[PDB]
């Protein structure tokens, strides 16, 4: 163990993959490399470390989703605490497995640096999300180098949920956040220009309104939105009123840039692991789907896991939950 | 030990306390919530970890001080190395004990993030004081959330002693330091507006002169001063000359803002643990007391401990030292 | 093990040294304190931790170099990973040994904080070089205090090789880098004004061109250059064309400031540990020596070690390599 003999890193072997189209940004759409408009449709699964701990990190999970749930995309929420606990080298080795599985099934990955808080002050909602600017840069530097020229890995979601929690974490400042995303994007593009960065707004990735006046000044990006049921709070709960509020905060973005709702979903207020902002009577499902389909918005439901809520499944035999059965039918129909 | 099951933090239970007035800032004074002018008068004790290590962290210490030494305030100098060694969760559990003890005795706490150095460059006088901007923010975020609405915890002293040690630690810059304090204050006020932040100047919390032109731009704060005997160095040592020098550097602040001299004290030049700037023949005692009483300045003597110098006590039976006997009489008389 | 009893640091004992001239900057030259023009001529050796691990950290190494290789200078490349692995206290104790050895032999040390990457974003070429702004400041704070007034330690080389690796590590920005060096210099000069800071440019300490318009705004400094054989790439390889390219990027600096080429050297393209940018047929040796001698440039060859390449020696009996035999003759002749 001489530190001077520690190897320089290696890149994923693209020859190990079957042919797969690259996804790219064109105006306000994604397109495949055949030129056809593309929509990300799929789910989040849990952090790789959580799945490994219960022996659920396996190809059979991806096969279930691709073959039975109609997904074309899986979002991997890589939690900083798990990145550190497994260690970068081991974690990347498991992401490699996901790449191979996904490629074999013809589906795509969104790699999400899964933190919640305010990166400019390095203050977070919970220790599982704890990180630094330095560690965040390093994650993207390592990821972009390793998966250079890998079509399967389509989207780099830079920071899951920006929030200052009522300014208890710092003073939210769009200019500062914009500049930091631009810095990350520049590192990424210096290493791989074929990948799609995904940028989020404040109020837990809900409010993209700042981009009306001050969008990120880089091409080829998309914007994230997390339009959970309780984020908009109209006094009268109907399509028209939710649509208008969604329009104002995030939906407008889809007129100019591609948008991925990288989290959405619900559970009954008296259901399993129910909490604000995910409580709903179920009318939200058809509403958000109708709204997204109208605008051509892409999405990954939270979450295809039986422990973390709101769940899509009740157990590891994949018994569907209320929202699981709903979205499964939606995705299957969209696939046709 | 699954990291996703680590609990979110809880707040101190205010129902566990007896009725106690809140202290607040009004102009250049502190007032209690009955509207009466209030003066912090008390002592520092040692870091909680030091006391626990010798089994001296107990209610009987607070009882000695309240009943026999006339104090209405105790300053807790929380050293970053001890915060890390005990760990936040355990350290906060011991601060809870202090809150309950102090509340029962009708006295107040000043919570002091006890570092010495230059936080903007993260360089310090000694490793026991080592911290980062990130860790400092986190400390105040955790403290402010936990003690929301707790009258007993009156003052949040953001950073004990700013100094660049002759610019060996960085280039002292008031604008940069001011901005950082303002950032901390904003985090604190976003979580609890009833607490009093206490801000310090350069030259080891001695020089408040920068606030003449550029005071912190936030309401409800106070300023710290550490007017140890050797900080002012008049050629002729008398009341008039020390008073003028104190006026110029820190005393003037009390005309506009409340001031707490959160450290002061002396030992004979040939006494126990004697060092610059605490050496004095004893004439300093009546002088600083006269000066503070004239201006209505609050204070906490350093230190009610038999090991750390200058001591107020010779042993844990509370045998008074020279300065201990002096200040004990002063505080007892002021209490009457 | 009470953290409050951890000692404050001590300074190297200058009384332990024999008389040795201080080296200082005067215009574009170094001069000794007798007023005579001085040129650093010597070698790098490996990191102290690497040498200790094979029992090669000993005075006999310095004696070999001074007595048999004509050196007046040794550059110590202190790798951050090794600084952390040995720990500051132990590492400084070994640097003390080097100081005593070097002083006894009448030779000088360049202390090099041996990182490769972009310090403003804290991203690096390899983990052995990993550091932070905080740790880098702390290193120089500790070094400058300890070796105050020690003539033997002549040059503080602040950061070995700045590079953004094609902007994959961050966006190279001269203004930001300049400001950071100025910050380090100010810390150093606040502690010891007799030492020479050595500042490097981008493209792995190759490109000093930014200083034409925006030199570091501090007196008494020198500039580093690492003119390895493949850094300049003329289509026709001859003296004239290399000289012009070297002139443009780094050589011009020697007209106004002292310059130390703190790394240079070569190995045959099919030789031991051959890599870009050190591959050459050997014509580089006479060329760079001629160029440096013309301009009065100082230098330390990389590297007097049998493992790290390009080597000056084949084994620890000091069998010379191709470049070793070449530079040994050059230095011996220059000494005469
Ligand atoms: Cl927010
Ligand atoms: Cl809730
Ligand atoms: Cl200062
Ligand atoms: Cl002293
Ligand atoms: Cl560069
Ligand atoms: Cl190569
Ligand atoms: Mg890709
Ligand atoms: Mg309070
Ligand atoms: Mg020196």
Q: Dump the DSSP string for B241-263.
A: HHHHHHHHHTGGGGGTS-EEE--
The span from the CA of B134 to the CA of A188, in Å, is: 25
Q: Residue C211 has what DSSP assignment?
A: G
The DSSP result for B132-148, as a single string, is -HHHHHHHHHHHHHHTT
Using alpha carbons only, what angle is made at residue C237 by residues C235 and C239, rounded to the nearest 5 degrees? 130
Helix, coil or strand: residue B170: coil
The span from the CA of A260 to the CA of A200, in Å, is: 10
Per-domain residue ranges of chain C: 1-336
Residues facing residue A73 across a β-bridge:
A42, A108
The span from the CA of B155 to the CA of B108, in Å, is: 9
Helix boundaries (H) for chain B: 48-53, 59-68, 80-86, 88-104, 133-146, 174-191, 202-205, 239-249, 284-295, 322-335
Which tokens is C133 given?
């702004």
Peptide bond into A310 cis (omega under 30): yes
A29-32 and A23-26 strand pairing = antiparallel
Residue in A172, A243, A263 with CA at minimum distance from that of residue A210 = A172
Q: Give A23 Cα–ligand 7 centroid separation in angstroms.
A: 8
Which tokens is B32 given?
């209690």
Residue A309, phi then psi, degrees to nearest 5: -115, 155
The span from the CA of A304 to the CA of A285, in Å, is: 16
Q: Which residue has the tokens 């969104």?
A: A110
CB C65 within 8 A of CB C304: yes
Peptide bond into C310 cis (omega under 30): yes
Which tokens is B154 given?
């009156």
Angle of helix B239-249 relative to helix B284-295, nearest 10 degrees?
Answer: 50
Using alpha carbons only, what angle is made at residue A201 by residues A157 and A262, rounded to the nearest 5 degrees? 45
Q: Give the resolution in Å.
A: 2.0
A196-199 and A153-157 strand pairing = parallel
CB A286 within 8 A of CB A333: no
Residue in A98, A112, A38 with CA at minimum distance from that of residue A65 = A98
Residue A229, phi then psi, degrees to nearest 5: -55, -35
A contacts of C121 (beta carbons < 8 Å): 134, 137, 183
A41-44 and A73-78 strand pairing = parallel
Helix, coil or strand: residue A161: strand
Residue in B204, B203, B200 with CA at minimum distance from that of residue B184 = B200
B37-38 and B41-44 strand pairing = unpaired
Q: Residue A207 has what DSSP assignment?
A: B
The span from the CA of B59 to the CA of B101, in Å, is: 6
With b for 16 or more beta-carbon neighbours within 10 A and e for fewer, the B283-316 pattern comes to ebbebbbebbeebebbbbbbbbbbbbbbbbbeee
The contacts of residue A84 (CB under 8 Å, 6+ apart) are: none
Pick among C190, C191, C192, C195 to test the B interface (most B CBs inside 10 A): C190
B contacts of C183 (beta carbons < 8 Å): 121, 170-171
Cβ–Cβ gap C166/A6 under 8 Å: no
The span from the CA of B32 to the CA of B25, in Å, is: 9
The span from the CA of B186 to the CA of C267, in Å, is: 59
Q: Give C231 Cα–ligand 6 centroid separation in angstroms.
A: 13
**In Å, how far is A147's CA from the nearest CA of chain C?**
14
Which tokens is B78 given?
């929380």
Cα dihedral across residues B39, B45, B47, B51: positive or negative: negative
* C85–A contact, CB cutoff 8 A: yes
Neighbours of A129 (CB within 10 A): 18
Helix, coil or strand: residue C200: coil
Neighbours of A97 (CB within 10 A): 14
Helix, coil or strand: residue C105: coil
Q: Residue B210 has what DSSP assignment?
A: G
The DSSP result for C214-280, as a single string, is S--S-SS-EEE----TTTS--SS-SHHHHHHHHHHHTGGGGGTS-EEE-----B-TTSTT--TTSB-
B23-26 and C161-162 strand pairing = unpaired
The span from the CA of C162 to the CA of C172, in Å, is: 9
The contacts of residue C68 (CB under 8 Å, 6+ apart) are: C318, C328
CA A164 to chain centre: 20
Which tokens is A140 given?
């993207």
- Integer angstrom CA distances of residue B161 from B136, B158, B172, B176, C187: 14, 9, 13, 16, 19
* B168–C contact, CB cutoff 8 A: yes
Angle of helix A174-191 relative to helix A133-146, nearest 10 degrees?
Answer: 30
Q: Please, how many CA atoms are within 13 Å of residue C268, restricted to the half-sphere of its CB?
A: 5
The contacts of residue B149 (CB under 8 Å, 6+ apart) are: B14, B192, B194
The contacts of residue C125 (CB under 8 Å, 6+ apart) are: C116, C117, C161, C163, C165, C169
Q: Residue A309 has what DSSP assignment?
A: S
Neighbours of C2 (CB within 10 A): 11
Cβ–Cβ gap B167/C190 under 8 Å: yes
Residue C302, phi then psi, degrees to nearest 5: -105, 120
* C305–A contact, CB cutoff 8 A: no
CA A179 to chain centre: 21
Q: Residue A29 has what DSSP assignment?
A: E
* B319–C contact, CB cutoff 8 A: no
The span from the CA of B155 to the CA of B39, in Å, is: 12
- Integer angstrom CA distances of residue C90 from A142, A232, C60, C111, C316: 33, 59, 21, 16, 25
Question: How would you class A238 by CB atoms within 10 Å of its CB: exposed for 0-12, middle for 13-18, buried for 19 or more?
Answer: exposed
Helix, coil or strand: residue B218: coil
The span from the CA of A213 to the CA of A210, in Å, is: 6
Which tokens is C86 given?
């040995």
Q: Report the phi/psi class of residue A192: left, alpha or beta, with left for phi > 0 and alpha for psi in -120 to 50.
A: beta
The span from the CA of A266 to the CA of C123, in Å, is: 40
Helix, coil or strand: residue B67: helix
The contacts of residue B211 (CB under 8 Å, 6+ apart) are: B201, B223, B253, B257
CB B306 within 8 A of CB B313: yes
Instruction: Sheet containing B161-162: give its strands across.
Output: B123-124, B116-118, B161-162
Cα dihedral across residues B109, B324, B309, B300: positive or negative: positive
CB B22 within 8 A of CB B14: no
Helix boundaries (H) for A72-194: 80-86, 88-104, 133-146, 174-191
CB C245 within 8 A of CB C232: yes
Using alpha carbons only, what angle is made at residue C290 by residues C287 and C292, rounded to the nearest 5 degrees? 105
CB B320 within 8 A of CB B313: yes
Angle of helix B133-146 relative to helix B174-191, nearest 10 degrees?
Answer: 30
The span from the CA of A334 to the CA of A34, in Å, is: 20
CB B125 within 8 A of CB B117: yes
Cβ–Cβ gap C187/B168 under 8 Å: yes
CB B299 within 8 A of CB B41: yes
Say if residue C278 carries a ligand binding annotation: no
The span from the CA of C227 to the CA of C207, in Å, is: 9
Residue in B312, B254, B305 with CA at minimum distance from that of residue B54 = B305
Neighbours of C276 (CB within 10 A): 10
With b for 16 or more beta-carbon neighbours within 10 A and e for fewer, the A176-208 pattern comes to ebbebbbebbbbbbbbbebbbbbbbbbbbbbbb
Stretch 3-62 of chain B: residues touching chain A, C-beta under 8 Å:
3-4, 6, 8
What DSSP element (H or E) covers A330? Answer: helix A322-335
Cα dihedral across residues C31, C34, C35, C36: positive or negative: negative
Using alpha carbons only, what angle is made at residue B121 by residues B119 and B127, rounded to the nearest 5 degrees? 65
Q: Residue B314 has what DSSP assignment?
A: S
CA B241 to chain centre: 26
Q: Which CATH number fits the domain A1-336, given the four candidates 3.40.50.2300, 3.20.20.80, 3.90.870.10, 3.90.1150.10?
A: 3.20.20.80
The DSSP result for C270-316, as a single string, is TSTT--TTSB--STHHHHHHHHHHHHT-EEEES---SSSSS-SBSST
Q: Give B173 Cα–ligand 3 centroid separation in angstroms.
A: 9
Say if residue A153 carries a ligand binding annotation: yes
Instruction: Sheet containing A161-162: give its strands across.
Output: A123-124, A116-118, A161-162
Torsion angle (degrees, nearest 10) of CA C241, C312, C43, C223 = 30
Which tokens is C327 given?
């530079």
Q: Which residue has the tokens 């960085």?
A: B170
Residue A169, phi then psi, degrees to nearest 5: -95, -10
The span from the CA of A22 to the CA of A34, in Å, is: 9
CB A49 within 8 A of CB A78: no
Cα dihedral across residues C207, C210, C212, C215: positive or negative: negative
The span from the CA of B44 to the CA of B312, in Å, is: 10
- Integer angstrom CA distances of residue C145 from A114, B122, C9, C11: 43, 17, 9, 6
Q: Residue A86 has what DSSP assignment?
A: H
The span from the CA of A304 to the CA of B121, in Å, is: 45
Q: How was this structure determined?
A: X-ray
Q: Give A277 Cα–ligand 2 centroid separation in angstroms.
A: 7
Helix, coil or strand: residue A313: strand
B41-44 and A123-124 strand pairing = unpaired
Q: Give C282 Cα–ligand 2 centroid separation in angstroms.
A: 73
The span from the CA of A265 to the CA of A230, in Å, is: 10
Q: Residue A209 has what DSSP assignment?
A: G
The span from the CA of A110 to the CA of A93, in Å, is: 16
């Amino acid at each position: 163990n001489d530190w001077w003999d520690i190897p320089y890193p290696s890149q994923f072997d693209v020859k190990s993959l079957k042919t797969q189209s690259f996804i790219s940004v064109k105006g306000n759409k994604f397109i495949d490399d055949k030129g056809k408009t593309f929509t990300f449709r799929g789910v989040n699964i849990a952090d790789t470390g959580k799945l490994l701990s219960r022996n659920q990190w396996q190809k059979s999970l991806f096969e279930e989703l691709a073959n039975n749930w109609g997904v074309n995309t899986i979002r991997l929420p890589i939690h900083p605490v798990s990145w550190r606990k497994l260690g970068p080298d081991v974690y990347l080795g498991h992401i490699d497995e996901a790449v191979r599985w996904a490629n074999d099934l013809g589906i795509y990955l969104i790699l999400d640096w899964h933190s919640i808080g305010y990166l400019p002050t390095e203050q977070y909602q919970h220790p599982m999300y704890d990180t630094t600017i330095k560690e965040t840069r390093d994650f993207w530097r390592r990821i972009t180098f390793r998966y250079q020229n890998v079509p399967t890995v389509a989207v780099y979601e830079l920071f899951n949920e920006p929030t200052t929690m009522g300014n208890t974490l710092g003073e939210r400042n769009w200019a500062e956040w914009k500049t930091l995303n631009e810095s990350l994007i520049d590192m990424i593009y210096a290493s791989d220009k074929t990948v799609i960065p995904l940028v989020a707004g404040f109020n837990w990735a809900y409010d993209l309104s700042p981009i009306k006046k001050a969008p990120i000044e880089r091409e080829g990006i998309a914007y994230a939105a997390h339009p959970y049921p309780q984020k908009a709070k109209p006094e009268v709960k109907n399509d028209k009123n939710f649509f208008k509020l969604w329009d104002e905060k995030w939906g407008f973005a889809a007129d100019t840039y591609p948008v991925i709702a990288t989290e959405l979903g619900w559970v009954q207020p008296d259901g399993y692991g129910a909490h604000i902002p995910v409580k709903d009577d179920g009318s939200y499902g058809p509403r958000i789907v109708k709204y997204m389909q109208k605008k051509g918005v892409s999405y990954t439901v939270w979450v295809f896991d039986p422990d973390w809520s709101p769940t899509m499944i009740n157990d590891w035999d994949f018994t569907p939950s209320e929202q699981g059965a709903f979205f499964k039918q939606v995705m299957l129909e969209a696939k046709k």
